[PDB]
């Protein structure tokens, strides 16, 4: 569905109201007043707006000339009131000292607009909604129609009354309009602001928010100023009341109003709405039918009426309770107690006069003790509190007793609240939230339910929106319908839809309509699971919370089939579809198809109740495991090798599989080892292997080798063992020694027995991977594969001739020395004399255990201790070299003795290991900031030696980058205290020092001045920067943060104090700098780890928008915008206008460039160029 809507094409909207007969919607706006249909189509548009005028002018230009300058200004609709009696609309504007309009009801024809007399003027105030009031009428000939109206005054105390009682004549042209009900030279039916109270408190004013007629009175919810709370402005939200029949204005009352939530004050009215409570809230709030109630909205505190806080609270007042607070206060002043206490009205406090009277609710005020205030602030019952999104508006209504509340939000959202304090629940609960102007257009106070009370017109700054009170049809399921709780919604069982009682046909009958989730349609089928192969199966259906279906019912499995059913007891009996019908469904979905079996009612003809119904298919299972150990009742036939539901369809009795453990499967043994090109049998074990029956062949082993697949026939010895016959196998590659191969055991040609563990045959080759004795004895003792001296190759005893009783050698337990060790290459080629180096030797024919190579390794004379974990047997030794300080040699060859330094069992390295002692002499900055982060370049000799390197400045470690013969480059850590620091480099067990080469911690560079204090949006101009220690940073750069973007640019250092920098581009398509200029969010410099320089607090650097220049003996004149910026001091751009290469002498002006020419033209200023 879509929300019916009226969009405000050009201007903001201010007020909305609904005609109780028609449902036409009238809409007050700035410069416009619209008539709209119930579904928000435009019906008529009145122009009321842009008027040539001025607020300062009294009587507006129409009546008298004003010396103040006039301008086309907007006319804001301040007020809107339906006068049904005189078939019209009072449409009160502003911007003419507040003259009022009369528009005819059905066409908006201006009937009248009185503006001659002073009463025809209402207020200068140009603010929308700060005004309110009520229209009240009697029959024609009797006491005529009156308007009670409050407005702000703006300090124009003597021009306008804030509250007034005014006359509404039947002729709109009649001059008597908006005249006071009773005017006297002593007392008029109006209430003015006293001049003395405006002198004392400068801009006190009364803003009228909401207003309503009740029984015989007229109430107003108001906002006022600090008068006992010159200083600052703080507001107090109050209730006002008058008797309708009090021309003298003596009935005026004024009590402060608000409410508190866990010690948090809410004292600013944003809206209100008088309503009924209906049977529900009335009863447990203790009220009579026609007793009224007032829903309200307050913001937190007493601050900023112009822009209130998010924190907002919906409170409640029963009018009987406000009536009692007023009666209680009057029966109190008529006891003579205290003062009247009304600051803004009576500055000097007059006292309460005692008198004997019958104080009633009918009391309409008397001559003495006059207009009076209120001491005890009236507290309201809180209901719902929003903390992240401020309430703005409210309405409410009676629905079948339960009291529904509507609440606008700053976001453009409406809340639908059941108030349940008087209802059973713990506290009043939100039911639902809805969207109007999602982008964040706030909802306005004027929020009216339609006449039929089916919709709720919700107004924003920019759009009216028809939001339905009931729209239960968005609810798809009984479970969600009654789950939303918004009380209009019930499940109309047989129509399977969610809607109100009056909308569900026959709802009054038993079980036809559901209102509590427990009434939900609940359905079950006895034979939940039915096989594809079955047909017309009898099923029984149990359903609860369903009306009398003696009308008739059909079963529809989905929109595929439909079978007739008959009714007995509390059960429904229908049949499954035919095999002819069932399979059209199940085709494609294979294993099973869960299908939603519905009930189609004969009365409605709509599916309402559902169940999970399963269509299972046994035959499509193509293995025992899937068949039995699946999820369903399926039987496997060992012998036919087919899955089916029927026991009898099996071959015969003793071939039925019902249990998963009884399935034909191959069991594992310890791994199947198969050498290539060797005649071997492969015995297998298994379980429940079938005796092949009539017309059935025997067993075979099929090997799935990509190169060659072998078919070898086998013998089944019993139900538990197999064996493929003597054969040899191969694969073409010689690429991988150990190849695992999928094998399938077949019988009768194509029946493959199940292989759960997925047992494989490993085809291994006596080595196509190992041409070294050490590699063979390295591999599995299982393979039986071993090294054969004479051949110079490696194969089994089987494949190698015994010319000697010990000609074939196998690693017995690894106690097998292996001949002629050889070293290929070793890493680190160089090392420190001190030792500690990890030598990484890689050979081919080494020892097979660690404890023989340990003690064997030596570097010339120097004892080398080998490492266990890092040793890879007969391929690689990792060894730690000892102290070589005492060695005379500079370089020595590496030696391994396998176990004993025997003459055949020794290896010597092809090239030799070199000992050096690295030294360093210079550092390439010798200075750097205390924070660190400096790129250091240590120069020396032999710096690339050994394994590990660690550089320590002041004991603290340097972050290493890269190493060289001649250089070590690392990044400096933070220094503790500024000044000279030791540089310690340790390579393995060698720790080299130099006290002549030190590092000097500085002092951190500083930034003092940037000279020009500005640049343009694209940047690129020269900046003459000054500071200290600038030569100690090799690559400094400028940083600037504009908006959400951060950008950087380069610098060129000259002195320790001077630097030229190219200004950073801030080019943002989101924000452009103004003509006036703008500071960046951040500005600074990136200098290593000195982070205090990244953000400059004191900087006044400005960014102007991207010079503008216009193209095509007398001098050159070049015109354009943005040539000169509004910069502090003298400082301006050094412009140079050039011709091919020759610069000119020019005088620069704000719009023009005065170059001088003797008769390709380029203009330069910093990093800027244009032709
Ligand atoms: C429950 O589930 C079962 C199994 O999943 C469904 O039964 C299948 O029905 C469909 C028909 O729509 C079959 O698919 C078609 O197969 C034919 C050729 O089938 C041949 O190959 C089979 C596969 O090995 C083999 O089983 C067949 O032998 C059977 O039939 C004989 C005689 O009745 C019987 O004695 C045997 O015991 C077997 O039962 C047969 O040799 C093929 O023409 C189709 O392929 C074409 O279309 C596809 C898709 O467009 C396309 O990709 C191809 O290129 C080709 O053009 C098609 O695949 C399927 O074979 C049946 N399954 C089995 C095991 O037989 C069935 O939906 C459900 N059962 C019921 C009762 O509803
Ligand atoms: C290290 O190197 C840096 C930059 O490389 C040096 O900074 C500059 O030094 C030179 C001298 O070596 C100075 O140039 C001289 O300027 C004067 C006239 O100054 C006027 O013109 C300037 C250039 O347009 C302008 O910036 C000046 O504005 C400054 O002063 C105002 C007001 O006091 C101040 O508010 C600003 O902040 C500016 O700082 C000013 O209007 C000129 O007379 C010199 O000419 C002489 O020298 C040349 C060459 O030797 C010779 O040929 C002539 O005959 C003549 O005798 C010269 O052009 C420049 O002022 C320095 N820049 C700054 C920003 O101060 C820096 O001095 C070196 N540092 C160290 C520690 O050694
Ligand atoms: C289903 O059918 C399967 C397969 O047909 C049977 O499995 C066989 O079980 C028997 C036990 O009866 C196993 O027989 C044993 O074989 C050993 C032979 O290994 C040697 O083979 C060759 C040639 O002799 C040598 O070169 C090689 O070096 C091996 O050493 C014998 O050593 C065993 O004999 C020992 O046990 C018996 C009985 O206790 C004693 O009498 C002997 O003195 C001796 O101690 C033994 O005979 C045979 O390996 C299995 N077959 C296969 C093919 O592997 C199942 O028994 C049967 N299952 C059921 C439930 O009925
Ligand atoms: C497929 O659909 C069928 C619909 O028929 C579902 O079957 C029902 O499954 C549930 C459990 O999953 C059973 O509920 C249990 O009942 C137990 C008591 O069982 C006895 O009483 C049964 C009814 O009175 C009776 O059917 C049953 O006899 C069965 O066993 C006999 C011996 O094996 C066999 O010969 C008969 O044919 C028959 O099948 C017992 O005497 C109780 O102890 C449990 O706590 C539980 O409540 C239903 O009884 C099943 N209904 C039937 C008619 O058997 C089935 O769930 C669906 N399959 C899947 C996978 O979802
Ligand atoms: C102005 O607003 C009015 C209402 O304020 C509105 O006119 C109404 O439209 C509704 C439908 O939106 C109509 O209600 C129909 O009543 C007839 C019986 O006479 C039914 O046959 C209709 O049922 C149909 O629609 C159902 C729901 O979509 C279907 O389930 C069903 O199969 C039928 O097709 C329906 O209930 C109604 O005619 C008027 N209301 C009145 C009082 O006449 C309209 O949307 C707005 N018009 C304009 C010009 O802006
Ligand atoms: C509840 O269930 C009952 C019984 O299960 C079911 O009755 C069905 O009624 C339809 C008529 O609506 C029957 O279909 C007819 O059968 C004749 C042959 O005898 C066909 O030639 C007709 O089919 C034509 O029309 C179809 C629909 O327009 C087309 O799809 C088709 O191409 C043909 O032109 C005709 O429809 C049907 O035989 C019975 N069902 C059975 C199982 O016999 C009924 O739907 C349900 N009852 C109610 C009141 O809804
Ligand atoms: C040797 O056998 C192995 C294992 O049987 C084969 O590898 C894998 O085979 C399995 C079948 O069990 C495949 O798994 C499948 O996964 C999908 C997941 O979407 C699932 O839907 C299927 O039901 C099935 O279980 C798997 O794809 C396959 N592996 C690869 C990488 O394809 C292997 O194919 C055999 N080797 C050769 C050379 O054929
Ligand atoms: C066959 O069914 C068995 C028994 O139900 C399944 O056994 C599972 O085995 C794993 C071990 O791999 C256990 O951790 C699970 O707890 C077992 N599951 C259950 C439910 O008992 C097995 O998954 C099924 N196998 C196949 C191939 O379908
Ligand atoms: C072949 O297998 C048979 C039976 O297992 C056995 O007697 C014979 O030793 C095997 N022959 C060869 C050459 O391996
Ligand atoms: C270290 O640097 C500081 C600040 O630049 C300097 O004053 C001091 O002389 C330097 N120390 C040495 C030993 O040169």
Short mmCIF file of C-alpha atoms in Angstrom, two decimals, residues 550-781:
data_model
loop_
_atom_site.label_atom_id
_atom_site.label_comp_id
_atom_site.label_asym_id
_atom_site.label_seq_id
_atom_site.Cartn_x
_atom_site.Cartn_y
_atom_site.Cartn_z
CA UNK A 550 -21.02 -27.11 7.83
CA UNK A 551 -21.01 -24.80 4.80
CA UNK A 552 -18.44 -27.16 3.28
CA UNK A 553 -14.66 -27.51 2.98
CA UNK A 554 -12.10 -28.54 0.37
CA UNK A 555 -8.45 -29.60 0.90
CA UNK A 556 -5.93 -27.97 -1.44
CA UNK A 557 -2.33 -29.17 -1.13
CA UNK A 558 -1.28 -26.03 -2.89
CA UNK A 559 -2.51 -24.38 -6.10
CA UNK A 560 -1.93 -27.80 -7.74
CA UNK A 561 -4.87 -29.98 -6.61
CA UNK A 562 -8.12 -29.92 -4.60
CA UNK A 563 -9.95 -32.86 -2.96
CA UNK A 564 -13.45 -32.89 -1.43
CA UNK A 565 -13.79 -33.66 2.30
CA UNK A 566 -16.54 -34.83 4.66
CA UNK A 567 -17.03 -33.84 8.31
CA UNK A 568 -17.37 -36.10 11.36
CA UNK A 569 -16.88 -35.37 15.09
CA UNK A 570 -14.33 -32.54 15.46
CA UNK A 571 -12.34 -33.81 12.48
CA UNK A 572 -12.10 -33.40 8.68
CA UNK A 573 -11.55 -36.39 6.38
CA UNK A 574 -10.04 -35.93 2.91
CA UNK A 575 -7.83 -37.91 0.50
CA UNK A 576 -4.29 -37.55 -0.90
CA UNK A 577 -3.93 -36.85 -4.64
CA UNK A 578 -3.43 -39.56 -7.28
CA UNK A 579 0.02 -40.76 -8.34
CA UNK A 580 -0.84 -39.09 -11.67
CA UNK A 581 -1.09 -35.77 -9.80
CA UNK A 582 1.51 -36.16 -7.01
CA UNK A 583 4.59 -36.60 -9.24
CA UNK A 584 4.08 -33.41 -11.32
CA UNK A 585 4.92 -31.65 -8.03
CA UNK A 586 7.79 -33.79 -6.73
CA UNK A 587 9.67 -33.82 -10.06
CA UNK A 588 12.83 -31.75 -9.60
CA UNK A 589 12.83 -31.37 -5.81
CA UNK A 590 14.09 -34.93 -5.37
CA UNK A 591 14.59 -36.14 -1.79
CA UNK A 592 11.34 -34.62 -0.49
CA UNK A 593 8.91 -31.73 -0.95
CA UNK A 594 7.37 -30.00 2.05
CA UNK A 595 4.04 -28.59 0.88
CA UNK A 596 1.56 -26.24 2.57
CA UNK A 597 -1.72 -28.16 2.67
CA UNK A 598 -4.51 -25.60 2.95
CA UNK A 599 -8.18 -25.68 3.74
CA UNK A 600 -10.39 -23.89 1.23
CA UNK A 601 -13.73 -22.86 2.77
CA UNK A 602 -16.86 -23.25 0.66
CA UNK A 603 -18.43 -20.07 2.06
CA UNK A 604 -15.52 -17.74 1.26
CA UNK A 605 -13.48 -19.72 -1.25
CA UNK A 606 -10.22 -18.58 0.32
CA UNK A 607 -7.47 -20.76 1.83
CA UNK A 608 -7.11 -20.00 5.53
CA UNK A 609 -5.52 -22.83 7.57
CA UNK A 610 -2.22 -24.54 6.79
CA UNK A 611 0.13 -27.40 7.76
CA UNK A 612 3.54 -28.74 6.88
CA UNK A 613 2.77 -31.76 4.66
CA UNK A 614 5.59 -33.97 3.40
CA UNK A 615 5.80 -35.72 0.04
CA UNK A 616 8.68 -38.20 0.25
CA UNK A 617 10.26 -39.98 -2.70
CA UNK A 618 11.99 -43.71 -1.54
CA UNK A 619 12.98 -44.90 -5.01
CA UNK A 620 15.21 -41.94 -5.93
CA UNK A 621 17.70 -42.94 -3.21
CA UNK A 622 20.58 -44.67 -5.03
CA UNK A 623 22.48 -46.14 -2.04
CA UNK A 624 21.69 -48.04 1.20
CA UNK A 625 22.90 -45.18 3.39
CA UNK A 626 20.66 -42.53 1.81
CA UNK A 627 17.76 -45.02 1.89
CA UNK A 628 17.76 -46.17 5.54
CA UNK A 629 20.06 -43.75 7.41
CA UNK A 630 18.18 -40.87 5.79
CA UNK A 631 15.29 -39.09 7.46
CA UNK A 632 12.42 -41.27 6.27
CA UNK A 633 10.91 -44.75 6.49
CA UNK A 634 12.60 -46.40 3.49
CA UNK A 635 13.73 -49.99 2.94
CA UNK A 636 16.83 -51.09 1.02
CA UNK A 637 17.03 -54.25 -1.05
CA UNK A 638 20.55 -55.71 -0.78
CA UNK A 639 20.05 -57.85 -3.85
CA UNK A 640 18.00 -55.73 -6.22
CA UNK A 641 20.14 -52.74 -5.11
CA UNK A 642 17.09 -50.45 -5.07
CA UNK A 643 15.33 -48.36 -2.40
CA UNK A 644 11.59 -48.74 -1.84
CA UNK A 645 8.78 -48.35 0.70
CA UNK A 646 7.47 -51.93 0.29
CA UNK A 647 9.18 -54.83 2.08
CA UNK A 648 7.79 -57.28 -0.54
CA UNK A 649 9.33 -55.36 -3.48
CA UNK A 650 12.67 -56.59 -2.18
CA UNK A 651 14.39 -59.53 -3.89
CA UNK A 652 13.41 -61.86 -1.07
CA UNK A 653 13.11 -61.99 2.76
CA UNK A 654 16.82 -62.14 3.66
CA UNK A 655 17.84 -59.12 1.56
CA UNK A 656 15.80 -56.43 3.32
CA UNK A 657 17.71 -53.57 4.97
CA UNK A 658 15.79 -51.68 7.69
CA UNK A 659 18.70 -50.72 9.94
CA UNK A 660 21.67 -48.53 8.95
CA UNK A 661 24.25 -50.78 10.64
CA UNK A 662 23.14 -53.75 8.49
CA UNK A 663 23.91 -51.91 5.19
CA UNK A 664 26.61 -53.53 2.34
CA UNK A 665 29.68 -51.42 3.12
CA UNK A 666 33.47 -51.66 2.98
CA UNK A 667 35.28 -51.56 6.35
CA UNK A 668 38.78 -50.11 6.67
CA UNK A 669 42.00 -51.95 7.42
CA UNK A 670 45.43 -50.38 8.04
CA UNK A 671 46.31 -48.48 4.88
CA UNK A 672 46.37 -50.17 1.48
CA UNK A 673 49.95 -49.86 0.25
CA UNK A 674 50.51 -50.52 -3.46
CA UNK A 675 53.87 -50.26 -5.22
CA UNK A 676 53.86 -49.47 -8.95
CA UNK A 677 54.82 -52.36 -11.24
CA UNK A 678 54.58 -55.08 -8.60
CA UNK A 679 52.23 -58.08 -8.71
CA UNK A 680 50.14 -57.84 -5.53
CA UNK A 681 46.81 -59.00 -4.09
CA UNK A 682 44.67 -56.54 -2.14
CA UNK A 683 42.67 -58.18 0.62
CA UNK A 684 39.70 -56.20 1.92
CA UNK A 685 37.28 -56.52 4.80
CA UNK A 686 33.65 -55.31 4.73
CA UNK A 687 30.14 -56.18 6.00
CA UNK A 688 26.95 -57.82 4.76
CA UNK A 689 28.29 -58.43 1.25
CA UNK A 690 25.47 -59.97 -0.84
CA UNK A 691 25.50 -63.46 -2.39
CA UNK A 692 24.99 -62.59 -6.08
CA UNK A 693 21.65 -64.09 -7.14
CA UNK A 694 19.98 -65.34 -10.32
CA UNK A 695 21.42 -63.82 -13.49
CA UNK A 696 23.95 -61.85 -11.44
CA UNK A 697 27.73 -61.69 -11.92
CA UNK A 698 30.53 -61.57 -9.33
CA UNK A 699 32.82 -58.89 -7.91
CA UNK A 700 35.45 -56.55 -9.35
CA UNK A 701 37.75 -53.83 -8.07
CA UNK A 702 37.80 -50.63 -10.09
CA UNK A 703 40.68 -48.24 -9.56
CA UNK A 704 40.10 -44.63 -10.51
CA UNK A 705 43.55 -43.57 -11.70
CA UNK A 706 43.34 -40.56 -14.07
CA UNK A 707 46.17 -42.03 -16.17
CA UNK A 708 44.82 -45.59 -16.33
CA UNK A 709 41.70 -47.09 -14.72
CA UNK A 710 42.18 -50.80 -13.93
CA UNK A 711 39.39 -53.44 -13.89
CA UNK A 712 40.37 -56.44 -11.74
CA UNK A 713 37.90 -59.21 -10.92
CA UNK A 714 37.71 -60.36 -7.30
CA UNK A 715 36.40 -63.12 -5.04
CA UNK A 716 33.87 -62.65 -2.26
CA UNK A 717 34.89 -65.11 0.41
CA UNK A 718 32.06 -64.45 2.82
CA UNK A 719 29.75 -61.64 3.90
CA UNK A 720 32.84 -59.90 5.35
CA UNK A 721 35.96 -60.14 3.08
CA UNK A 722 37.06 -59.49 -0.52
CA UNK A 723 40.28 -59.72 -2.61
CA UNK A 724 41.31 -58.34 -6.00
CA UNK A 725 43.59 -60.78 -7.79
CA UNK A 726 47.34 -60.67 -8.48
CA UNK A 727 48.02 -57.62 -10.64
CA UNK A 728 50.38 -54.64 -11.01
CA UNK A 729 49.44 -50.95 -11.30
CA UNK A 730 50.99 -47.75 -12.69
CA UNK A 731 50.49 -44.04 -13.36
CA UNK A 732 52.28 -41.92 -15.95
CA UNK A 733 54.13 -38.93 -14.52
CA UNK A 734 56.92 -39.71 -12.02
CA UNK A 735 55.86 -36.42 -10.39
CA UNK A 736 54.40 -37.54 -7.04
CA UNK A 737 55.70 -40.43 -4.92
CA UNK A 738 52.51 -40.98 -2.90
CA UNK A 739 49.26 -40.98 -4.94
CA UNK A 740 46.03 -41.87 -3.13
CA UNK A 741 43.45 -43.40 -5.48
CA UNK A 742 39.66 -43.69 -5.23
CA UNK A 743 38.62 -47.35 -5.54
CA UNK A 744 35.12 -48.61 -6.22
CA UNK A 745 34.10 -52.21 -5.50
CA UNK A 746 31.51 -53.38 -8.04
CA UNK A 747 29.48 -56.51 -8.58
CA UNK A 748 27.20 -57.57 -11.44
CA UNK A 749 28.81 -54.92 -13.66
CA UNK A 750 27.47 -51.66 -12.27
CA UNK A 751 26.32 -52.21 -8.67
CA UNK A 752 28.85 -50.21 -6.65
CA UNK A 753 29.07 -51.16 -2.97
CA UNK A 754 28.98 -48.29 -0.49
CA UNK A 755 32.29 -46.81 0.71
CA UNK A 756 31.54 -44.61 3.77
CA UNK A 757 35.11 -44.03 5.02
CA UNK A 758 35.95 -43.55 1.30
CA UNK A 759 38.80 -46.09 1.41
CA UNK A 760 41.64 -45.45 -1.00
CA UNK A 761 44.60 -47.31 -2.44
CA UNK A 762 47.97 -45.57 -2.13
CA UNK A 763 50.09 -46.14 -5.24
CA UNK A 764 53.69 -45.41 -4.27
CA UNK A 765 56.77 -45.35 -6.45
CA UNK A 766 60.17 -47.06 -5.36
CA UNK A 767 61.70 -43.76 -5.94
CA UNK A 768 60.92 -41.62 -8.90
CA UNK A 769 61.28 -38.95 -6.19
CA UNK A 770 64.49 -40.07 -4.46
CA UNK A 771 67.90 -40.59 -6.10
CA UNK A 772 69.71 -40.41 -2.76
CA UNK A 773 70.12 -43.12 -0.08
CA UNK A 774 69.18 -40.59 2.61
CA UNK A 775 65.85 -39.83 0.96
CA UNK A 776 64.72 -43.49 0.81
CA UNK A 777 65.45 -44.54 4.36
CA UNK A 778 63.79 -41.22 5.24
CA UNK A 779 60.43 -42.39 3.80
CA UNK A 780 58.00 -44.86 5.44
CA UNK A 781 59.21 -48.09 7.01
#
